[PDB]
Every structure is written in structure tokens, then in C-alpha cells.
Ligand binder design. Structure first.
Ligand code: HEC
Ligand code: HEC
Ligand code: HEC
Ligand code: HEC
Ligand SMILES: [Ca+2]
Ligand SMILES: [Ca+2]
Ligand code: NA
Ligand code: NA
Ligand code: NA
Ligand code: NA
Lengths: 337, 376, 131, 125, 376, 355
């Protein structure tokens, strides 16, 4: 049932029959050749790699939200996410659960596969069929293939090899500068399966991505409120906050941030200097030669963490890039420059 | 047996082996309770100073408070806050002087008020606890001024504002007994009762002179505001007791802390906070030793304990260190605190047996003043 | 006691200057002024800046990254003073340097030094300093 | 050495706590921070206020009135600290009281304690 | 044999016996000379600190200067003034920060300038002499800033005004060589020459890289501005000498303060100010001891003396105390100053024989920095 | 010579032949029954004295001659402070020069010139004998020598024990013959620890052999014009008494308004007080100093008038460093200082303390 459930999810994952007009599968936007992101909507498509390590969405005892799926956490976990994305008009866009069940019923392999795991006639019950498909998709993403922990960083932490001087400097910067306040699992101690995110929600004051927003059709009067958009969240302190992404594979999953606003990994690193540096250049996005832009949501910024008092000089930017490239899974190392 | 440092190592190691995570953060002090004790370090007149907040049960520093030049600490008896009157200058020890009162939350230690005192009016003196004092309701702080003349400043802690200076006669120390009344000790040997309003000359009355000019009353009497009991030793260990609990001073019989034989053999109190008073047991504790008549500010190695009502000696403890100040917790089976200015160490003893239980060292440069709350 | 001898870490007392996580501490141990091994005392401000050392833990034979953080905004505690410099590099390699007052990022712009905490942030070592 | 023994004056070293003019000094001897027995160190301000003690001089068997004056406006020197209290009375007899910071009258309103000088002002009587 | 305190007692007794009157007053320090030495006490990171002015010939404290948190002292080589960049806060160690430069008259010790530095721009670090520096004409003070990035502030001592901050690369320390030029040491192993205008980004030029990434240059090199000589030891006692006298860096031949055999037997430099240089003798002094490679900040008990031109060893002195910092006077027959942080004492030695002549104790809480003027 | 010269001075001191109309001697204004001061009521009370012409009033209060012989000759010390001399403004170098100045002053004894003084000396056979035996035959025929000799004799007389007996209760107590009352002893302790000691003690440190409770310096303590005396003197509403700057040869504007610190010996019996006799009562002179230290309203009010003390006559050069001590004398300490200053009264004047 473990292997079998995941194997069913693997077949679903590449099947365009789960899309409104049979045009795209999960693999369309999450290409395994590109760390399960889009090699070719208002938000950037995130990697599926290591998404299975994220806890279910919850409010912790200090009142911080953590975990969940989607950039705004609107899904509790992978199973709930799969159901949402199959029905979401901006992704798979299936009109309803009965339509999904009907596509499944049309395929003799799915009758066999789903009945063996969930019982005879499961595909005749739209709620049970849809829930089973979401569960199989979640199981598939929870396999080792999606989270293999075989990057250079992994090998170095196992003592199998060593960082280069530049990578070791980048590692030391990462763990002593503000990056570790958000892009490490734990506050202290050593994580067993580190994915370079504390699963929290933070507004880092990103500007709108003009061209993506234009193309989304959402209208220029649209504002993306991040976590506040999750149904049931009403707390106005959550407005503009987004889930901290895992930095695993980050070197190969550009463009960056929730809206794809920066094309280059170095730009994403330099953005943090806008909070710390007094140089005129720290104000300028190097990809455009113009000021970064005012925050899309000008409240709830994580100023305590971001206004660290220290600017990254170019050498430390080079070092962080080198360190972030060591978090690339083995099968993606050929993609590095 | 296991020290705090050892227990903490054992716990962090257990946390590490178990993969337990915790967030680095700013701790809260534990809730004020009867066994909390504060030690102030005037630091032999340094321009800046420190107060240590100590859990007397565990013998653990649980927090600190910084202060300026010779600040006067106070601690509300009910545990609700602590405060001090303090003095800073714009270039360490030179330049513009600012005197101010800070009020602190007793768990976060964050200042909840900072109240400027106009015209730099504090009396700068080696620290005497009853030179700055809270009224019983905790709403007002009264501080002493010496220059240009004796006067008492009135600070409204509730409204967070300086109110006024009161002119007083040639008198010293401030023992409040009500929201608008306090007592002082006058050069002429009487106490003065001062009843004051927001404006207007205060009403000042004097007791009879209760000591002659050649009997010397120490700068550190014990005063229990909850009992209205003022316990005032002289250089020879004769102890005056004045009951202010009715609102007017009634005098109690004077007692001797030392026997006639001990005084003939050179026993005399000495140190800084030489006397403590436990209100529920109605017991007095006095630091004494064999000493020359003019070595009255030296440390002492003994504490005598006497029944305040009869003068009967109940114990004489060999403290086993050079002790400058004492005080007690005001709970049932109290701790006797014994602070060494030279060792910069608070020794915490069982007040009934005199046994040293534990100690807290490295308390600044010259710690001198112990304060506890009477929460009962 | 021989101050020039190779430092010998121990895992039995966090208030002593040879406790294994203090291998590059400079200042005062927070646990001695009302903090704990990894928390600041009340009234002080926890810096976000840090310096790091790879400190060998004799108990388990592993070397852990300790990313020291200062607790700031109070005069120095004066209790449990310690200076160790295992793998400590000069100021031009500031990620390893421990004379600097690492109070950056502390609330209220606190920048005076009160004491330092010794939290673990990783299990690694360095080219210039490995067990 | 025995702190509780009767104080024993000498007239041979002004930097020691038993120098005869220090019989009621509280603080630090100015000679140890760049002053002298009866002058303040550079940078400090000489108070006009004083406290008095009658101090016995073993050189001539005379008791003299030492009218201490503080040097003010600097943090406490930390060198040659001493506290003696011969004839010292509590704060309500301030002319003989020595816990008070007698910095009144110092130039520039200086009121922090640096050290104390020990000049003679008269014969005791 | 007769100490300063005994000689003073005799003079006072003679004045009394003679009926000599004298006016109590504020003394002037003796005129600054080659044998004056300054000792700065960073007081183990205390919020307020002290500098001691000492006559090295008599071994006498001749004055003091108060400072704030980790101040940087500088001494004009010609004796005409001293200065520091210092930091205070409005409530001891908390509240609004003010950084400022004070210039002092070297005989009355009165501040003759108090120049605020905007936006609290100093680098707060255990004290390194070459993190704040005077230009050779004395008109300009340069100080290092670390946050948000390496930078150097320009303070005009003549106009008594902060001027501006200079952007620099990832470099450390400030060695001025002209009214408008200084050098810094860069992370990449080069020195940067920085030449600055009234206005404009400075002109910055790097030297060749002169040491590899695993050769560690200490925080306390010696620099003789009058010689243009930068003397820079590494952790192993290899000594870089850089000649700045032409206005550009010329790297002199490397010299080893320790033999190969000594290094294999564990000898390494160690302490705080580990290195001194005498300009007229062209001579290098280094504090060294047997020590583990990561005990580089512990005291050392020996000094080696070497010829700067040949590297030949001239002497090896057993200092007799735990010494953290050294320096020398710059006159003929120099004194060798040996400061112990732990003992709070400056030991004053004959530099030629190395023998201890006299000492000055009670130098605050953790004294660490010695500065002399090069007046010849 | 020594005794004989003082004896000649004794005769001159009481001889009204040394005044133009022969109405007054030194003893008229310096009456031995009143510690050598002027008991006579004039148009300004006892504040200022009336001269030989019966009409002219001085603008300053006649000081005691007791202990004036202990004052050093006028000089500038190495710190640039002037000290010593005679008169409230130091305009006489010493007693001998003072004597000549007063004999010729038209506001006082009013002798027209030295020859006129020599003429009067020549009229008296005892003077012919007394002066010739000490100064030589024919001395009284040379007006310069006659006059200088007379001034010398008068100076010698004032230097005798009668004028400086050191027999006050204070002196008795310092010799260990009696004790102060507790009030006197407190007054003494206050005087020597408060600012009074910075001006009214001979030495800055150490012990004086013959203390006269003045350091002989010149200070402006910021006194107002005594208006009734200034009216009586006729000097005019625009007159300013510049104190030491009025001494010939002193030109430094920093000396304006400074007067010689008076000995406090016999102070209790020599009111009214200050250089212009402005305060009747000893307690008022002491209370004046609280105007620099007390913040109470009453401290700026002269208790004799119930009005403000008044603007200083000379607002520049006040001794503020000494005066602004930071500490106010309460009534107990004022009582104590009065008791102590009363102990400085010579034995022969103790009966005057009753009144
Ligand atoms: C048309 C492109 C597209 C298709 C097809 C698509 N996705 Fe996505 N995926 C996205 C975008 C865009 C987001 C972020 C959307 C947001 O945050 O609101 C997303 C987010 C997710 C996440 C959240 C990961 C995280 O870190 O937040 C998971 C898991 C996910 N996709 C899985 C799936 C699965 C399983 C399928 C097939 C059922 C699927 N995707 C189909 C574009 C797509
Ligand atoms: C205050 C928490 C916080 C801090 C500190 C922080 N980050 Fe981030 N980071 C985020 C969040 C949240 C996002 C997603 C922001 C968004 O898209 O709205 C992010 C996005 C990124 C991305 C883009 C990842 C992707 O998949 O799009 C990179 C690269 C990154 N961070 C690196 C760093 C580095 C390097 C530092 C240290 C200079 C750092 N961050 C500091 C919270 C933080
Ligand atoms: C008309 C009254 C009068 C007569 C007569 C008079 N004096 Fe004076 N005496 C004064 C006054 C008034 C002063 C103060 C004047 C001043 O300071 O300007 C004075 C001051 C002095 C002083 C200075 C004392 C001091 O402390 O400054 C001496 C000495 C002196 N008189 C001696 C004499 C002698 C000797 C004679 C007789 C030759 C004499 N006086 C006659 C009124 C008089
Ligand atoms: C700054 C120097 C100075 C100080 C301090 C000072 N005095 Fe005086 N005192 C004087 C001078 C000068 C005079 C005469 C002033 C004048 O008449 O112009 C004077 C006059 C007096 C007189 C009047 C004497 C007379 O013969 O008319 C009395 C009484 C007196 N002082 C008492 C004191 C007492 C008591 C104190 C201390 C509370 C004191 N003084 C402080 C300088 C001082
Ligand atoms: Ca991306
Ligand atoms: Ca008079
Ligand atoms: Na775009
Ligand atoms: Na919502
Ligand atoms: Na009048
Ligand atoms: Na003149």
C-alpha cells in the first residue's frame, strides 16, 4: 500500500486528464528536470522538492503561524493542497470533484489502481475518488525521490567531502548573518533533515512584479495579502506575509520570491541589503537599474530581523551564492553554471 | 549538592541528546516572592552602579538593574514594583547633571516610568535606605535633599510626575506612615511628623527629644512600614523603638543588644546596615563585634538576635565572614541575609539556627545595601 | 589554571570558563546574571548578530557550531568573566573574531555589552580549525 | 590590618590609610591620582564645602582640625581607597559626617566624587 | 628607597613645622615629555572607563581622564594634545547613544574640544590603537566604522567638526601617512592606500597581496608615524615590515621573531599589544611565551628584542609577571613598558637590560592599552 | 626708643590739637570705650562719622583700631591678589601712612598741610622734648620730618598690646583655660567648615600664631549703597565707592568694588557693619551671606528693613566662587555663629555684650 499508493500518485502526477481541458499535468508546471518547477497566474511556481518536510499548518504557542502549503499557506498540508490545485481556476481548473472522478473512471488503469487501494466502486463516489487522488498525489511527493538529501551540503555534513574556501565562507556568513533567523528549521540544535526554512510567514517588503501582475489579469488594483488570504485567517498582522521557502535547489529554481520578481539568485541576495546598507547602490535593483519599488504591503514588515545593522559586501554576496549552490540535489548539479 | 551550573549542564546535555529545540529569548524573572532579595552596589562612589536581584531560596541571580551615581533603591512591600532615584551626567562624571526616578516592572525589569527631578535635587550620600522611601500605598516616593537646606521632594509615581519640595526643619531620613505623612529625625533629637498637601506649608510637629546630643543614632535604622515600627540602634547597641502605627509616635522601652559585660569588653555594633527587624516574629538582629569606639563602619562577624518586646537575647550567631549589612526575609521561617562589601558576596543563612545555607558572589565592586519586600 | 595550556573542554558546569560551548566566548556567561545557557537576562536585548566557533563536545566527540549572541543594553555583568579563543581569527575575519561587540540587531539599538549566550546552530568545523 | 582595632596614626607616608591626617577620610587619597596631600588632581574641581575631624599628629602630640575637601567632577579614582571614622558622627551632625559627598561649591557645579585632600585648618578646641 | 608617599609626608611635616602656608588648588600635570606614558583601562567592557596619565621616570600617576564605553585614545607625537573618541548613553548603558571626540590640554587635562559624531558611528570593539588615528600634522582624527560596513570617519580637530564618512573596501585599521592619506589592511591580504579630498569618494589603491589567507595578522601591529614604519606580526611571530615613508608601501624583508626550534617547542607571541617598535634604534620588541596555538590573547612572560634591518635577535627578557601589553618610550635609553591586565599594574623596565625599575598599580579594572608620544 | 615712641603716640592719639579747629582727636572717632570705634550719632546714625568742622560726614564706617597692627603692609602677592594695607580700600600702605592721610583729610581732622601740624607740635613743650629725644634737635622745625615723626609715633602706639590683647573668650578657650558652651562650639565648627573660613582666617592651611579672622585680602561681597550715609556724605547719587580701585596706583578694573576683609575680633561690639555701616545688627550681617545660597524668599530680604537687600553698589568682581557655597545657614547655625563671634570680644569689652 505504501509503494502502491505512491506509484498511483506518480501516474496522476503526469496525467493531463486532471486538467480542465486535458492540457497540463502537475509535471507541466513542476518539471522533474528542473527541480519540480516551471522551465517555460500571479505567483511564481514553487519547487515540490522537500515540500513533504513542511509541517501541517498551525498556530504555534507564541501566536506565529507555521507550515502549510502554497505561498500563503491556504492549504493545511500536501493532500489538501492537491485537492485545491486540481480545482483552482489558475492551476488545473477542474470544474468540480465529479469531473475529476469521471476522468479517473475513464481510465482502466485507474479503476484497477484506485480500487486496489481504496475499495471497489471508489471511482463512482466523487468525494471519495477526489480525496483518494489527492492522497495518492501527496504520497508520491513524500517519496525519497522528492527529498533525497544528496546535495553537496549533505555530503559535507556527513563528512564525505569538504566545502571549498568560498563555500565554507558562504556557509559561515549564512549561519551568522540574519539569513539563519528565517532559513533554518530550528532556533538552535541541529536539524536531522534541514531544509533551510523555519516554515514561518514573513513580509520582507517585496515590490509588485509589474509585468507578472499585468499578465495575471488580476487587475492593477489587486494587492496580494499573502497569509491573510487563507480562509479563517483574519488577523491583520498577517497581511503581506508569505511562507519562508526552503532554499534547497534554490540555485536552479529562478526566478525568485512569491511573484518571480528577481530573475537572478544574486539579485535576491542583494535585495536584503536594502534594509542594512547606506550605499546609494543598495537602493537599486541591478536587474533594472531602478529603485527596488515600494512594498506591495507596507505593514507587518519583519524589520527586527531585516534591519540587522550589517551590509553584505560583494565578497560575502559571492560567498552566499557559492554556499546556496551546494544545496542543489545531486541530479541537478549539471544545471549549475 | 549539585550546583546550579552543574544542573544546567546536565539539562542542556539532555536537551542536546534528545534534539529538544528552544528559542533564544529574554527571560522573565520568576514572580517576586518573600525570598527575593535585592543587593545594591554603590561601588565605592563610582559614577555608575548596579543592583542584583536574587532568588534567596536558590541562591541565584535572577536579574540586574543599572543605576547612576549613589542611587536610592526602594521595593514596594506588596511585590508590585521596584524603583530608584538616580543621578547621571552628560560626560560620565562631569557636565550636565540629571536626577530622575525610574520605576521597574519586577518580572521584566523594564522601566515603566522615568521621571525627571528638576534642579538636580537629590542628596548624594553613601547609600541610606530611608533617605528615599515609598508611602504605604506605593503611590508616592519621597526623597531627601540636603542642599541648600534639608527638604523632602514629593514624586507622584501614579501620575509619573515630580510634585514639589517641602521645607522641613533641620532633620534627616524619611519614614512614611500614610499617603501624606512621614516622620524624620531631627538634629535636636526629636522626631518631626510632617503632614503635607499638594500646596501649602506642611504641618510639622515634633515629639519630645528622645536622645541627648552625645548618644549617636546610626545612619541605618530598620523601619517596618507595615508594623509602623522604627528600630534605631546607637553606636553602643542601645536600641530605640518607636511605634508610629497609630499615626503619632508612641515610644517603647529602650533595650540593650549587648550585655554590660560585653560592652566593657569592647563589643559594639558596626558595619553599614547594622540592624534588621522581622515583623511577624517581632525580632531584632544586630551586627556586632569587638571593636574600638570609632571603628563603627567596619565589618562585623556576629549577629545577636533579640525579642523586641522584652530585649531578651534569643541567639548570637558566628557568621563566619566579614559582614557589613544584614536584613531578613519577612516570611515564616525567615532567611538572614549577610552581605560582605569586601568579599562582594551575599551569604544566606537560616535565621533560626544561624547556619550558612548558600552564597552568591561577584556582586559588583562594593555591595552595601540589602532590600526585601514584606509581602505578608 | 595554566592560562597558556591547550584548553580542555568539559561538559559538567556551564558557569565555568572551560565549559565546552564557551570555546570562543569573550565577556561574561549569561547564566550568571539571570539569563541561561541560551537566553538573555531580563531587561537586556538579544542581538541578532553573531560570531561563530566550532567547539568540540568531549561528551559525544562531535564538533558543534556555537553562534554566540550578546545580550545588550546593560553595563557588563561582572559575573563569570571568560575569554577563550579556540579558532579565533583577527578582526579582518570578523565571522570568527571575538573582540567585537556583537550587539547589532538588538532591540532599541542596544549596543553595550552585558553577557553572551552559547547556543548550538550546527554540527560542523572549519578549514582553519577542526578537531 | 585588624580592621576593628583602634586606629593608629603615622606621620611617615601620606599614601597609606593610617597617615595621621586621614583620620576621617572616606574615599580615596588625592595624592594617588595626580593631586597632592592638599591639592586636587588636574581636571578635577575643588569643593569649598568641608567636613572636619580632630586628628592627632604623632609627630608633635598636637590634635589638629583637618577640614577635608573633596575633588570633584571625575569618577572615583580607584587608587588608595581608605575609610576612617575617628570622631565621625551620623548624618544629622553633618559637620562631622563623612558619607556625604562634600562637593558643594566646586566649580562648574561638579558633584561626583574623585578623591579627598587633607589640609589642616586649626588646632582642636 | 624613600617612596613618593614618604617624601610627601616629610615635606608636609616640614611645611607645618615651618608655618609655610600654601593655597589648596588644582594642580597642573608636569609638561609632557618622552617618558610620559598613558594607560587605558577598557575595564572588561564596562560602560565607563579611565585613562591613567603616568610619569614613567618617577612611576607616578600624574592625572586621569574619564571615558565612556570602549573609547579610543590618541596622543599627539609632539606633546601638544591628547584626544579620544568615546561613547555615552543617556541611562548608563541604555537609551540614546552619543559618540564624540574630546581633545584635552595635556597639562590641565581640561577638554578643549567636544565634537559630537553624528549617527553614533564608532566601532565598538576591545581596544585597538590603530582603529582611531591622528594625521601627522594633528589637525585630523580618523576613526574606523564597522556597521553597516567598513568606513572611516574624518574629524577636523582644527575646525572642531565632524566632516564626513569615507567609503572603503573590506579593510581594517587606519595608518595615516599624510594630511590626506592613510593605509588600511584588507581581508584579501593587501593594504589599501586611501587618499581623501574635501569632497568626493577617496582615491583607493591596493598593494600586492603580502600574506596568504592562512597567515593571521594580529589586531595590534605597531606603527611609527614619524618613521612610516608598520610592524605587523602574525600568530607565529613572523613579522611583516611595511615602509610607508615614500608615501607608498614598500614591503621590507620578512623577519622571524622566534627560531624554527623555538616554534617547534611551542613558542608563539600572545597577549594584547604584543609588539613595540623603537624608531631611533630601529628595533622590534615582541611578547612571547610557550603556548597552545589558540591561546593567543593570554599574557606572556617574555619579550624578545630584534634588529628590524637584519632580524638578528638582540635580547630575550624574562619579564617576571604575566604581561599583556608592551610599548616603549622613544627617547634615547628607552623604557620598556609592560602592562598586566590581571594585576592592573604597569611594570616599567630598562629596555636595554630588561630589568624592572618600578611599577604603578591600581590601574583600574582591566587595563590593556599603553600609548607614548614620539617627541624627538 | 620702642616704649618711648609708643608713649609719644599715646599722647598724640588723644590730642585734639591734631585737628584744624581742635575739636577732635583720634580718640573722638576711635573711642577706647567702644573697641576704638565712633559712638556718636550723626545724620546717618552710627554708620559714618563727623569731622572736625562739625558738618562733614564720611562715606565709610569708622573701623576698630584693635588688631590693625597685625595687618601686613600693602602688597600684590604672586597670585596677583592684593593684601594688607590700611583703610577699607587699602589706600594707605601701613599704619604710618594711614596716620598722615587722616590728619590732612578735610572730611576728618582737616589739618591744612604739614606745616600746620608742625606748628601745633611746636606749641607744646612736652612735644618739643618728646620728639627731640627720639628724632633729634630741630625735628619740629622741619614740617616734613615733624609730620612723619608724628605718624610714626601714632603707628607705634597702635602696635602696643593694649590694642591687640588676645584675651577674648576664644583666646582663653584655645589656651585651654575655659571651654566653649555647646552653642559657641557649634558656632566655631560651622565657622571653620563653612565659607566664612575662606576669607575670615589668616591662613589658607596650617595654624595662625595670632589669628585675627581675616586673610587681609580684598573682596567684593556685593553690598548695596547705604542710602542715608551716602546722603550724609554728600558724594552724590551718581557716586560709586570703587573700594580698592580708588587706591592711587591701582588701575585694574577687576579691583573695583573690593574692600579689605575686616578682622572679626570685637565684631559683636563694633556695629553697625560693613564698609558703609549699612547693617545695624550682627545677625543681619551674617544673614546677608544667605542671599548667595538660600532659595527661600526671605533670604533676599534685609530683616532690618523688610525690603530687598538692594542691587550691589558694584555689580562686577563679586567673590561668587566663595559666596555661592551651595549651603544655606539655618536659624540654629546663625545663632551658633553669633555666639561664636561674641567669643571674639576682648575681655574689657564683655560688659558691652549685655546691651
Ligand atoms: C499551471 C501551473 C501549475 C500546475 C499544473 C500545478 N501547479 Fe502546483 N503550483 C503552482 C503555483 C503558481 C503554485 C503557488 C500558488 C500559490 O501559492 O497560490 C503552486 C504550488 C504547489 C505546492 C505548494 C508548495 C509550497 O512550497 O508552497 C504544491 C505541493 C503543489 N503546487 C503541487 C502540485 C500538484 C500535486 C499538481 C498536480 C495536481 C500541481 N501542483 C499542479 C503551479 C501549478
Ligand atoms: C525575516 C525572515 C527572513 C530573513 C532574515 C531572510 N529571509 Fe530569505 N526569504 C524569506 C521569505 C519570507 C521569503 C519569501 C519572500 C516572498 O516571496 O514573499 C524569502 C526568500 C528568499 C530567496 C528566494 C527563494 C525562492 O525560492 O524564491 C532567497 C534566495 C533568500 N530568501 C535568501 C536569504 C538570504 C541569503 C538571507 C540572508 C541575507 C535571507 N534570505 C534572509 C524570509 C527571510
Ligand atoms: C572723623 C573721625 C575720625 C578721626 C578723628 C580719625 N579716624 Fe581713623 N578712621 C575713620 C574712618 C571713617 C575710617 C575708614 C576710612 C576709609 O576706609 O576710607 C578710619 C580708618 C582708620 C584706620 C584703618 C583701619 C583699617 O582696618 O582699615 C586706622 C589705622 C585709623 N583710622 C587710625 C586713626 C588715627 C591714628 C587717628 C588720629 C590721627 C584717626 N584714625 C582719626 C574715622 C576717623
Ligand atoms: C568672599 C570672602 C568672604 C566670605 C566667604 C565671608 N566674608 Fe565676611 N566679610 C568679607 C568682607 C570683604 C567684608 C567687608 C565687606 C565690606 O564691607 O565691603 C566682610 C564683613 C563681615 C562682617 C562685618 C564685619 C565688620 O566689621 O563690619 C561680618 C560679621 C562677617 N563678614 C562675617 C562672615 C561670616 C560669619 C561668614 C561665613 C558665613 C562670612 N563673613 C563669609 C569677606 C567674606
Ligand atoms: Ca522560483
Ligand atoms: Ca563697624
Ligand atoms: Na517583471
Ligand atoms: Na482570510
Ligand atoms: Na542707612
Ligand atoms: Na586707582
Amino acid at each position: 500500500a505504501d509503494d502502491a499508493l505512491a506509484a498511483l500518485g506518480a501516474q496522476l502526477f503526469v496525467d493531463p486528464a486532471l486538467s480542465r481541458n486535458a492540457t497540463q499535468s502537475c509535471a507541466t508546471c513542476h518539471d522533474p528536470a528542473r527541480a519540480f518547477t516551471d522551465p517555460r497566474g500571479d505567483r511564481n511556481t514553487p519547487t515540490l522538492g522537500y515540500a513533504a518536510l513542511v509541517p501541517a499548518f498551525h498556530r504555534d504557542a507564541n501566536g506565529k503561524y507555521k507550515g502549510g502549503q502554497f505561498w500563503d499557506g491556504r492549504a493545511d498540508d500536501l493532500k489538501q493542497q492537491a485537492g485545491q490545485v486540481m480545482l483552482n481556476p489558475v492551476e488545473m481548473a477542474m470544474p468540480d470533484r465529479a469531473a475529476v472522478a469521471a476522468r479517473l473512471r475513464d481510465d482502466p488503469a485507474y479503476r484497477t489502481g484506485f480500487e486496489a487501494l481504496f475499495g471497489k466502486g471508489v471511482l463512482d463516489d466523487p468525494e471519495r475518488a477526489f480525496d483518494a487522488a489527492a492522497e495518492a498525489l501527496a504520497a508520491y511527493q513524500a517519496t525519497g525521490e522528492f527529498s533525497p538529501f544528496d546535495s553537496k551540503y549533505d555530503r559535507v555534513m556527513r563528512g564525505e567531502e569538504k566545502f571549498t574556501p568560498l563555500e565554507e565562507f558562504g556557509y559561515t556568513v549564512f549561519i551568522t548573518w540574519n539569513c539563519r533567523l528565517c532559513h533554518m528549521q530550528r532556533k538552535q540544535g541541529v536539524a536531522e533533515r534541514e531544509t533551510f526554512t523555519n516554515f514561518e510567514y514573513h513580509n520582507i517588503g517585496l515590490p509588485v512584479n509589474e509585468t507578472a501582475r499585468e499578465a495575471s489579469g488580476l487587475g492593477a488594483d489587486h494587492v496580494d495579502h499573502g497569509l491573510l488570504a487563507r480562509p479563517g485567517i483574519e488577523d491583520p498582522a498577517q497581511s503581506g506575509r508569505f511562507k519562508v521557502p526552503s532554499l534547497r535547489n534554490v540555485a536552479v529554481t529562478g526566478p525568485y520570491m512569491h511573484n518571480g520578481v528577481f530573475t537572478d539568485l544574486r539579485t535576491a541576495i542583494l535585495f536584503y541589503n536594502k534594509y542594512t546598507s547606506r550605499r546609494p547602490e543598495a537602493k537599486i535593483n541591478p536587474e533594472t537599474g531602478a529603485p527596488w519599488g515600494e512594498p506591495e504591503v507596507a505593514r507587518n514588515l519583519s524589520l527586527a530581523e531585516l534591519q540587522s545593522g550589517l551590509m553584505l559586501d560583494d565578497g560575502r554576496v559571492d560567498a552566499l551564492v557559492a554556499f546556496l549552490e551546494t544545496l542543489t540535489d545531486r541530479r541537478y548539479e549539471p544545471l549549475l553554471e | 549538592q549539585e550546583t546550579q551550573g552543574q544542573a544546567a549542564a546536565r539539562a542542556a546535555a539532555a536537551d542536546l541528546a534528545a534534539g529538544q529545540d528552544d528559542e533564544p529569548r529574554i527571560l522573565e524573572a520568576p514572580a517576586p516572592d518573600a525570598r527575593r532579595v535585592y543587593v545594591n552596589d554603590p561601588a565605592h562612589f563610582a559614577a555608575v552602579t548596579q543592583q542584583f536581584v536574587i532568588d534567596g531560596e536558590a541562591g541565584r541571580v535572577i536579574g540586574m538593574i543599572d543605576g547612576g551615581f549613589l542611587p536610592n533603591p526602594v521595593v514596594a512591600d506588596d511585590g508590585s514594583f521596584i524603583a530608584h532615584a538616580s543621578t547621571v551626567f552628560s560626560r560620565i562624571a562631569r557636565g550636565e547633571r540629571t536626577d530622575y526616578v525610574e520605576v521597574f516592572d519586577p518580572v521584566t525589569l523594564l522601566p515603566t516610568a522615568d521621571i525627571e527631578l528638576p534642579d538636580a535635587p537629590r542628596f548624594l550620600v553613601g547609600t541610606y535606605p530611608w533617605m528615599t522611601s515609598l508611602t504605604p500605598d506605593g503611590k508616592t516616593l519621597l526623597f531627601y535633599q540636603f542642599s541648600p537646606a534639608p527638604a523632602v521632594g514629593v514624586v507622584d509615581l501614579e501620575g509619573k510626575a515630580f510634585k514639589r519640595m517641602l521645607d522641613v526643619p533641620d532633620c534627616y531620613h524619611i519614614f512614611p506612615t500614610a499617603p501624606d505623612t512621614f516622620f524624620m529625625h531631627c538634629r535636636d533629637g526629636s522626631l518631626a511628623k510632617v503632614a503635607f498637601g499638594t500646596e501649602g506649608t506642611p504641618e510639622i510637629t515634633h515629639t519630645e527629644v528622645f536622645h541627648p546630643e552625645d548618644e549617636f543614632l546610626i545612619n541605618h535604622p530598620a523601619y517596618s512600614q507595615k508594623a509602623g515600627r522604627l528600630v534605631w540602634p546607637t553606636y553602643t547597641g542601645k536600641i530605640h523603638q518607636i511605634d508610629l502605627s497609630s499615626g503619632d509616635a508612641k515610644f517603647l522601652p529602650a533595650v540593650e543588644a549587648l550585655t554590660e559585660a560585653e560592652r566593657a569588653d569592647g563589643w559594639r555594633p558596626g558595619g553599614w546596615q547594622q540592624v534588621a527587624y522581622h515583623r511577624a516574629l517581632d525580632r531584632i538582629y544586630l551586627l556586632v563585634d569587638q571593636r574600638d569606639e570609632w571603628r563603627h563602619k567596619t565589618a562585623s562577624r556576629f549577629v545577636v538576635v533579640l525579642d523586641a518586646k522584652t530585649g531578651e537575647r534569643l541567639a548570637k550567631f558566628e557568621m563566619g565572614h566579614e559582614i557589613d549589612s544584614i536584613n531578613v526575609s519577612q516570611d515564616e521561617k525567615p532567611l538572614l541575609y549577610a552581605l560582605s562589601t569586601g568579599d562582594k558576596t551575599l551569604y544566606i543563612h537560616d535565621a533560626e539556627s544561624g547556619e550558612e545555607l548558600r552564597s552568591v558572589n561577584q556582586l559588583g565592586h562594593g555591595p552595601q545595601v540589602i532590600t526585601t519586600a514584606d509581602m505578608g | 589554571t595554566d592560562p597558556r595550556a591547550k584548553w580542555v573542554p568539559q561538559d559538567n558546569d556551564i558557569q565555568a570558563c572551560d565549559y565546552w560551548r564557551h570555546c570562543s566566548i569573550d565577556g561574561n556567561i549569561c547564566d550568571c546574571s539571570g539569563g541561561s545557557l541560551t537566553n538573555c537576562p531580563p531587561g537586556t536585548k538579544l542581538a541578532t548578530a553573531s560570531w561563530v566557533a566550532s567547539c568540540y563536545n568531549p561528551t559525544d566527540g562531535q564538533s558543534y557550531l556555537i553562534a554566540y549572541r550578546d545580550c545588550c543594553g546593560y553595563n557588563v555583568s561582572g559575573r563569570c568573566p571568560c575569554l577563550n579563543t579556540e579558532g579565533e581569527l583577527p578582526v579582518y575575519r570578523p565571522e570568527f573574531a571575538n573582540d567585537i561587540i556583537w550587539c547589532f540587531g538588538a532591540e532599541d539599538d542596544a549596543m553595550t555589552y552585558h553577557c553572551t549566550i552559547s547556543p548550538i546552530v550546527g554540527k560542523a568545523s572549519h578549514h582553519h580549525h577542526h578537531h
